[PDB]
Design an enzyme around this catalytic site. Structure first.
Site, PDB file in Angstrom:
ATOM      1  N   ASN A  52      -1.352 -71.532  15.228  1.00 24.81           N
ATOM      2  CA  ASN A  52      -2.795 -71.558  15.056  1.00 24.81           C
ATOM      3  C   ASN A  52      -3.285 -72.972  14.742  1.00 24.81           C
ATOM      4  O   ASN A  52      -4.013 -73.553  15.553  1.00 24.81           O
ATOM      5  CB  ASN A  52      -3.244 -70.608  13.938  1.00 24.81           C
ATOM      6  N   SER A  71     -14.578 -71.298  12.655  1.00 28.65           N
ATOM      7  CA  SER A  71     -15.451 -71.277  11.489  1.00 28.65           C
ATOM      8  C   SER A  71     -15.915 -72.670  11.098  1.00 28.65           C
ATOM      9  O   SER A  71     -16.938 -72.808  10.411  1.00 28.65           O
ATOM     10  CB  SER A  71     -14.714 -70.638  10.338  1.00 28.65           C
ATOM     11  N   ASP A  87      -2.357 -60.167  13.493  1.00 24.90           N
ATOM     12  CA  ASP A  87      -2.087 -61.570  13.815  1.00 24.90           C
ATOM     13  C   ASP A  87      -1.299 -62.267  12.705  1.00 24.90           C
ATOM     14  O   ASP A  87      -0.416 -63.088  12.983  1.00 24.90           O
ATOM     15  CB  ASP A  87      -3.399 -62.311  14.080  1.00 24.90           C
ATOM     16  N   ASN A 145     -10.531 -72.965  13.031  1.00 20.60           N
ATOM     17  CA  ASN A 145     -11.265 -73.921  13.858  1.00 20.60           C
ATOM     18  C   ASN A 145     -12.658 -73.412  14.212  1.00 20.60           C
ATOM     19  O   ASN A 145     -13.643 -74.163  14.160  1.00 20.60           O
ATOM     20  CB  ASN A 145     -10.462 -74.173  15.149  1.00 20.60           C
TER      21      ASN A 145
END
Lengths: 250, 251, 254, 253
Positions: B110, B154, B45, B152
């Site tokens: 992200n 976490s 990613d 987000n």
């Protein structure tokens, strides 16, 4: 118009109902409890839900308006200009369908639907779009509409969602979340056409709440959640975030 | 058709790439580093985020595909008949970040986060030009829908299916006492909503956009809104998001 | 007895410092910033922390006192308008000593630090969390925070930790944004450790860490291990009244 | 010594119970009480012998997934029959007083909820009002109870040698009317937490597996009990390992 009015039924609330009906009498406005195109709720958000649950079959041609003594736009002192303007802007919010299987029963929710164990431990398999997702053990699950996110959902740590978003949000109630019953923890927000299916593992008796109403269901095979095809329409004459500010920040 | 492939640069990623181009040599497809119609990301990613940020200016006629060697990489090193397969294009929402001082704009796949440079982070949060809260804490995070499974998550944010067009705001270590008070809850905004972070004392901020972090001085305003631009994914098969979530966090 | 006074450095505090010193002159009291038996901090919880750290090596021979102008904080019992009677009470030597537990942080390459509030570790941040020599979890995230009991009302609280009565001898570990996935499975919950328990943080890939102790954050290169444990040392407060911790909690947050 | 064994009552537990007996039995004054099944079985044996906690050491075998009071595996029953023919470890307990007076001992926790409708209570610490709470309810856990319902509610895990109690909120309402601390609260011995009604006086009060409805309560008081529970210990299995094995992973099984 065709319209009708519900009222909380106390001291102050009945009078405004009488005044407004009398106020609408001066205009091209017809009262009817059977097919209103406009439903006016006078009281509180608790009052509004009964008005909604009374006309679930005419959500297709009704716009709702609330009078407050998150669903009420007007204050009682503004009622008269409401009648006039209403004599003279529709927005829709998503709703939540709940299906219980045993002949299946279906329910529509404006805030949320919750599921708990009848009395023992609550354990269910969570299946999303026919694929197993987690096996949950705990107090329960709460599935909320976007408008419902400011209510019980918020208390469970869910996200507050602008009510224009078409979704449903799942929150955990006291998950054990250990290696036997591993769960995601986070709230999950689903788009339209996703189905969340709750499947029992041992016990089959469940307390299922839909908004105010809590019903014990025996011998459940499955509880299914999805965003409804039906929507609720408000007559608008709406700063959601400021209301959030006024209600919680202060 | 015209294409290119990126690699994280380890052994297998560089090696698998040349294996793929040599296989692409067997077809009517031209390698091209400046104007790809298809961009193939080989690694993870993070490698995918770099590929996206390398081609931010040509997002409208690029379809992205990621292969993972160890949420954006669906494919496993099945690679060669993927070349043979190489169908539908799929779209994800993105996040626009605008910083005002000459204003600068950034695109995120992200999230974008804001932290103080050093010392106390205090900001007024203004939603659609109306003041909402005065936040004090470590910082704030604004996530895309596909970014919801990342930082987000976490921070306690909701995981959102990436087809929902929205952005999600989460708090980092809010201070909640007698006259700093914040909503606490994550907030999910639709298109056309603008969230404005306006400084209260300090004007220097560490601003995160995906993997890049930059210090900005004399910040006037940080503005978040869902971008009009989208990133397009090349999809060949059924890999559903919720199973990807189950695979990452449940198993 | 021997004493000293620190001041946050504003005019109102410096003046209060001068007046108190003059007030101690009428008694058997000697000013001494080198070997004080009493340390008086005038300002805030931040001033107190600097006073604490100025004398870490004489904690067994000091009783601390904090004076704060308005919002009392958690370390200051005295308001400046009461300075006179505190000079009188302290000169007489009523007061009783009450002790708070402290946090020892050991960094190995070896350096040790004492915290009165908390110590934090930041970097990608990946560490093995080893409790009493047994592997407990492999954490990936922003970092970790280990707090004292009196420290639970500060950064610990913001991370979701429990507020603990400062008479309980423990330390509390809270996560900062754990990824908590199948590769890095973590407990999520704050963990509260008694004395003699050791929490060891062991790096897996990167070895450089930003380490905070109360304010002070230090970049440590090539860290091999970070160890947390309840200190054998305590901080002692000179107390003249029944210290109501929960009322201060109420007043600061409610 | 005098001993006895409880069982969850399923196949493996009843048989293992009879089998261990084959390996003086006394239901009325045991010095050792053995629970076979799970932590829920352990809780029942504890509450069965509340009046002799000073002259009992408890021991548990878990018939399924690992528990926090039932540490022993069925395959070790024999090394236990041989072992039992040790030293004591003691955990703190939680005292609940309901005033209208009834008093209860808990090993895990006591929770308070409304019977139906809104749960609102005044929370009083050591005679001083601390907060007005509205939500689903409150939970007060012992140290060993922190790994059970407390944990699911966001409480801290505390090593059970710490003498304390922990208060957590259940689905708090935090708006312009009701502000609460949010954070869990850990109290030492001798602190009293009193929950006082505001409007409704009917409460569902649970103590461990028991849930009780009380009408027209005046006060619910929590404090660490002077009484303790003793576990008979033969070998090293630390609390944090139990925590790890239950919540993180259990690679060897």
């Amino acid at each position: 118009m065709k319209y009708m009015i519900t009222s909380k039924g106390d001291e102050k609330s009945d009078l405004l109902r009488l005044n407004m009906i009398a106020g609408f009498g001066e205009y091209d406005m017809e009262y009817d409890d059977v097919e209103p195109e406009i439903v006016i709720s006078i009281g509180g958000d608790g009052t509004f839900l009964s008005a909604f649950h009374q006309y679930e079959e005419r959500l297709d041609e009704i716009a709702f308006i609330g009078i407050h003594t998150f669903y009420a736009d007007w204050r009682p002192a503004e009622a008269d200009k409401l009648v006039k303007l209403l004599a003279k802007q529709k927005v829709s919010y998503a709703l939540l369908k709940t299906t219980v299987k045993y002949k299946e029963a279906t329910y529509l929710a404006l805030n949320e639907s919750t599921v708990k164990s009848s009395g023992g431990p609550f354990v269910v398999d969570v299946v999303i779009n026919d694929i197993h997702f987690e096996r949950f053990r705990g107090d329960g699950l709460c599935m909320s509409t976007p408008s419902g996110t400011t209510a019980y959902n918020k208390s469970l740590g869910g996200a507050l969602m602008h009510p224009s978003i078409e979704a449903m949000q799942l929150t955990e109630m006291a998950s054990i979340n250990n290696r036997v019953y591993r769960t995601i923890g986070s709230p999950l927000v689903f788009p339209k056409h996703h189905v969340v299916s709750l499947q029992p593992v041992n016990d089959k008796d469940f307390q299922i709440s839909v908004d105010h109403l809590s019903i014990l269901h025996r011998d459940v095979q499955e509880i299914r959640y999805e965003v409804s095809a039906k929507k609720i329409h408000f007559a608008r004459f709406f700063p959601f975030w400021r209301r959030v500010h006024d209600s919680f920040i202060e």
